[PDB]
Structure 1
Amino acid sequence: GAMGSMERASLIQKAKLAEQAERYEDMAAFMKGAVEKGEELSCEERNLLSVAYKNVVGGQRAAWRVLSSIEQKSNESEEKGPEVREYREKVETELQGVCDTVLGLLDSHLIKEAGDAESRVFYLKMKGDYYRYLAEVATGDDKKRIIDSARSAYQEAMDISKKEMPPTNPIRLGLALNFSVFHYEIANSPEEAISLAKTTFDEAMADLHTLSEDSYKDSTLIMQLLRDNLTLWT
């Protein structure tokens, strides 16, 4: 790797600079280099890793959706050649490459070394998320297996989070939010999505009384996203 000669602490420092400059591809490359040093990541470092790759894949997903919509309109009327499909495929392949990179970091060896609930749930949620992004573009004989891989990662994360974290924990809430999106948008299970969002919101509501002002703000921000989805879905 091109980051093999840079100090771990320097990679982290530069990832933070890249974030300030909105240079998310650089940020992701720095954080990949930091992961590959082989040490476990702190809470701050895990969040840097997620912010970096979420922004990279977010731009790719937005572009893929634009190109996929153009391609769909083209197949309704004048023939324009292979260019739309070719370019959609180019963006899709780069998206899949980023997802494979993230999944590879989780598999070598972030998940297997993560013993505390906060780290393990965070990484398993990420695994579900990046399989979900792969599922968004999957169309062939592997769509079912990709969907099953996302479901399995989310389910393992859910089981740990329910046993080890309070219902207001932001990681637990964000996991439940994303698993509900998986059910609605990927798994053709809107009723499961709605039930999960409702139960998650209500259990968090009942635990808010235990929280400080700052933790209350952290939890209610995610709870509002669950409510926004319920409003969209019902």
Structure 2
Amino acid sequence: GAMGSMERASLIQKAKLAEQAERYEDMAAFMKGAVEKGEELSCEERNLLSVAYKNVVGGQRAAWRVLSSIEQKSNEEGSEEKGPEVREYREKVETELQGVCDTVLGLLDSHLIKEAGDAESRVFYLKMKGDYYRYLAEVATGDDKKRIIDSARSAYQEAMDISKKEMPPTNPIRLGLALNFSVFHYEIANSPEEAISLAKTTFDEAMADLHTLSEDSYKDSTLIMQLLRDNLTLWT
């Protein structure tokens, strides 16, 4: 309804223009409108959806971390009392972040995931579901933290099971999924050993499949493999 009166193709065209203009809130709203047309998304369209919300929530996460750090310093020995403002503003940013995560999860649940029959689309969306519950987990502190974490884990696990059965080890979505599930284990689930094991196995199995690939696919796969190595270098 926000975008209910615009053509699907026009929303896609404008999402690509907004990306070019680095207008990612606009990008996300256009792609939300496209999803709400009710048709499945093509591969390029799923990419646009992911890029848009990655950038929106990425700016919110960076701001939340800045403010959380300030708030934590305010609660140390020797820190003068500055009043409620830092907590209030952190909460404001946190609430808007949670709203963005909720919006993406709503799109996945109504009805992207249930209509996604192909391995590539179903794994793509389940990875997103894991990612956006992970972002909720990064800020969760109350009664529902454990359920939020388990919701991320469950989405990632279903995606991993499908990707293992249905996609080659070098597939970029399979690799980015494994990368992010490994980050979940390290940063969210207090399971650094699992994170390291997953990253290593993922890297080694892709290495052994590179020989099957074209020059262009090899470039795509080795790019994500380097992020696995970067994490392993950080974590070990």
Q: Same fold (TM over 0.5)?
A: yes
Between the aligned partners of 1:228 and 1:80, the Cα distance in structure 2 is 39
Verify: 1:225 aligned to 2:227, yes or no.
yes
Counterpart of 1:41 in 2: which secondary structure? coil
Q: Could you tell me how far 1:40 is from its partner in structure 2?
A: 0.2
1:26 is paired with a residue whose SS is helix
Q: Secondary structure in 2 aligned to 1:13? A: helix
**Deviation for aligned residue 1:66:** 0.2
Post-superposition shift, 1:231? 0.3
Alignment partners' CA distance in 2, 1:129 and 1:104 = 14
2:188 match: 186
Q: Per-residue deviation at 1:164?
A: 0.1
* Structure 2 portions without partners, runs of 5+: none
Query: Following the alignment from structure 1 to structure 2, what is the Cα–Cα distance between the partners of residues 6 and 214?
Result: 36
- Could you tell me how far 1:4 is from its partner in structure 2? 0.3
User: Equivalent residue of 1:166, what SS?
Assistant: coil
- Determine the C-alpha separation between the residues in 2 that align with 1:51 and 1:2: 20
Q: Deviations over 1:45-86 (max 9, x none)?
A: 0000000000000000000000000000000x1001100000
Q: Matches of 2:51 and 2:209 in 1, distance apart?
A: 28
Please give the per-residue CA displacement for 1:166-212, whole angstroms capped at 9, x wherever unaligned. Answer: 00000000000000000000000000000000000000000000000
Q: Which residue in the other structure is 1:109 paired with?
A: 111
- Given candidates 109, 124, 127, the residue that maps to 1:125 is 127
Alpha-carbon RMSD across the aligned residues, in angstroms, is 0.3
Cα distance in 1 for partners of 2:91, 2:218 equals 44
Shift of 1:25: 0.1
Q: Deviations over 1:62-111 (max 9, x none)?
A: 00000000000000x10011000000000000000000000000000000
Q: How many residues align?
A: 233
**Cα shift readout 1:4-33 (whole Å, capped 9, x = no counterpart):** 000000000000000000000000000000
Does the alignment pair 1:215 with 2:217?
Answer: yes
The sequence identity of aligned pairs, in percent, is: 100
| Cα separation, 2, equivalents of 1:159 and 1:81 | 49
**Distance in 2, Cα, partners of 1:25 & 1:175:** 24
SS at match of 1:32: helix
SS of residue in 2 equivalent to 1:40 = coil
Matched, 1:63 2:35: no
Give the whole-Å Cα distance in 2 for the aligned partners of 1:61 and 1:30: 22
- CA deviations on 1:132-190 (whole Å, 9 max, x unpaired) are 00000000011000000000000000000000000000000000000000000000000
SS across alignment from 1:37:
coil
Aligned partners of 1:197, 1:132: CA distance in 2, in Å? 18
Matched residue, 2:26 = 26
* SS in structure 2 at match of 1:4: coil
CA distance in 1, matches of 2:140, 2:20: 33
Aligned to 1:147: 149
In the TM superposition, what is the alpha-carbon distance from 1:2 to its structure 2 partner?
1.3
Q: Does 1:48 align with 2:44?
A: no
- The equivalent residue for 1:10 is 10
